[PDB]
Amino acid sequence: RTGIVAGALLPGMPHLLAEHPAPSWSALAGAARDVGARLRRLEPDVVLLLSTQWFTVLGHQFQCDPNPRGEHVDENWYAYDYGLLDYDLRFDVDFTERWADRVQAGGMQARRTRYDGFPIDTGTIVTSALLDPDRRLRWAQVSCNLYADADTLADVGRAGAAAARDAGLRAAVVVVTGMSSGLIQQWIEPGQDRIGEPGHDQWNTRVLDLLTAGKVDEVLAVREDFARQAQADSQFRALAFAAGAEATTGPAHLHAYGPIWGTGAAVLSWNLPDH
Amino acid sequence: RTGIVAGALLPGMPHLLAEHPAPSWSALAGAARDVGARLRRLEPDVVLLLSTQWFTVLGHQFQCDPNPRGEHVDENWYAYDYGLLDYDLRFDVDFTERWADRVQAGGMQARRTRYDGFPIDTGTIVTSALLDPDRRLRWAQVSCNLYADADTLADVGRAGAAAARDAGLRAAVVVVTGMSSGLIQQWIEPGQDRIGEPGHDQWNTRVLDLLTAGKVDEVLAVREDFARQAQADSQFRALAFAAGAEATTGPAHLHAYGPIWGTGAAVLSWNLPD
Amino acid sequence: TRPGIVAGCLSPHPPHLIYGENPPQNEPRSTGGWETLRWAYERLRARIRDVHKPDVLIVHAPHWITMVGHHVNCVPNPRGLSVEPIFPHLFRYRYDFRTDVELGEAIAEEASGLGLVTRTLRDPRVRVDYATIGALHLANPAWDIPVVSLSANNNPYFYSDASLTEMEVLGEATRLAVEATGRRAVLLASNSLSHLHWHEEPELPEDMEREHPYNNHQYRWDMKLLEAIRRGPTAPLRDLIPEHIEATASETKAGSLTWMLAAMGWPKVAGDVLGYGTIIGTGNAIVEWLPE
Amino acid sequence: RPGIVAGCLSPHPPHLIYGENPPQNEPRSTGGWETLRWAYERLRARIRDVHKPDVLIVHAPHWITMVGHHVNCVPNPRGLSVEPIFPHLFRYRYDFRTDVELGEAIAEEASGLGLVTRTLRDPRVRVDYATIGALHLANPAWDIPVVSLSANNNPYFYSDASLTEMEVLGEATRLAVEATGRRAVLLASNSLSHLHWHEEPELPEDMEREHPYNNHQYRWDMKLLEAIRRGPTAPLRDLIPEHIEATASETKAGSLTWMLAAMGWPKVAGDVLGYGTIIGTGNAIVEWLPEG
Ligand SMILES: [Fe+2]
Ligand SMILES: [Fe+2]
Residue ranges per domain, chain D?
1-292
DSSP 3-state of B248: coil
How far is D205 from D210, CA to CA, in rounded Å? 8
Report resolution in angstroms.
1.8
Contact D219 C273 (CB under 8 A): no
DSSP 3-state of A101: helix
Ligand number, closest to the Cα atom of D151: 2
Contact D208 C223 (CB under 8 A): no
Q: Identify each DSSP E strand in B35-179 by its residue range.
A: 46-56, 60-63, 69-73, 84-88, 110-113, 139-145, 170-176
Angle at D182 between CA D177 and CA D187, to 5 degrees: 70
How far is D119 from D130, CA to CA, in rounded Å? 19
- Which chain B residue has the Cα nearest residue C124? B73
How crowded is residue A103: how many other Cβ atoms within 10 Å of its Cβ? Answer: 24
| Chain C from 65 to 94: CB within 8 A of any B CB | 66-69, 81, 83, 85-89, 92
DSSP 3-state of C51: helix
Farthest CA pair distance, chain A: 50
Helices (H), A135-199: 150-166
How far is D55 from D67, CA to CA, in rounded Å? 26
Instruction: Give the residue from A122, A153, A185, A260 with the most D CB atoms within 10 Å of its CB, the best one to mutate.
Output: A185
How far is A71 from A50, CA to CA, in rounded Å? 21
Phi-psi group of A198: left, alpha or beta (phi > 0 → left; psi -120 to 50 → alpha; rest → beta): beta
Strands D69-72 and D117-120 come out as parallel
DSSP 3-state of D62: strand
Kindly state the DSSP code that residue A117 receives in the 8-state scheme. T
Q: Nearest to residue D156, comparing CAs of A62, A183, A151, A18?
A: A183
DSSP 3-state of D198: coil
Partner residue opposite B118 with nearest CB, options C64, C88, C158: C88
Q: Nearest to residue A153, comparing CAs of A245, A241, A257?
A: A241
C271 alpha-carbon distance from chain centroid: 15
How far is C31 from D107, CA to CA, in rounded Å? 46
How far is B26 from C105, CA to CA, in rounded Å? 35
DSSP 3-state of B35: helix
Residue type, A46: V
Chains with 3+ CB–CB pairs under 8 A to C are B, D
Strands A60-63 and A110-113 come out as parallel
Describe chain D by its helix, strand, coil percentages, rounded to 5: 35, 20, 40
Whether the Cβ atoms of residue D256 and residue D240 lie closer than 8 Å to each other:
yes
Instruction: Give the residue from D41, D215, D222 with the most C CB atoms within 10 Å of its CB, the best one to mutate.
Output: D215
Residues in chain C with CB shorter than 8 Å from the CB of B118 are 83, 85, 88
Experimental method: X-ray
Any contact of D with A, at least 3 CB pairs below 8 A? yes
Angle at C224 between CA C132 and CA D137, to 5 degrees: 105
Strands D78-82 and D91-95 come out as antiparallel
Whether the Cβ atoms of residue B265 and residue B242 lie closer than 8 Å to each other:
no
- The number of residues in chain C equals 292
- Which chain D residue has the Cα nearest residue A52? D156
Edge-to-edge, what's the strand order for the sheet holding C185-189? C118-121, C70-73, C147-153, C56-66, C185-189, C5-10, C282-289, C272-279
Distance from the Cα of B108 to chain C's closest Cα (Å) equals: 8
Q: Nearest to residue B248, comparing CAs of B10, B32, B4?
A: B4
Strands D4-9 and D184-188 come out as parallel
Any contact of B with A, at least 3 CB pairs below 8 A? no
Residue D142 CA: distances (Å) to CA of C223, D135, D287: 28, 8, 20
| Chain B from 155 to 194: CB within 8 A of any C CB | 178, 181, 183-187
DSSP 3-state of B173: strand
C252 alpha-carbon distance from chain centroid: 9
Count chain C–chain D contacts defined by CB atoms under 8 A. 56
Whether the Cβ atoms of residue C265 and residue C175 lie closer than 8 Å to each other:
yes
Count chain B–chain C contacts defined by CB atoms under 8 A. 100
Provide φ and ψ at C230, rounded to 5°. -75, -20
Angle at A267 between CA A261 and CA A271, to 5 degrees: 170
- The number of residues in chain D equals 292
* Distance (Å) from CA C160 to ligand 1 centroid: 14
* Distance (Å) from CA B160 to ligand 1 centroid: 30
The angle, 0 to 180 degrees and rounded to 10, between the axes of the packed helices C101-113 and C164-180 is 130
How far is A157 from A172, CA to CA, in rounded Å? 12
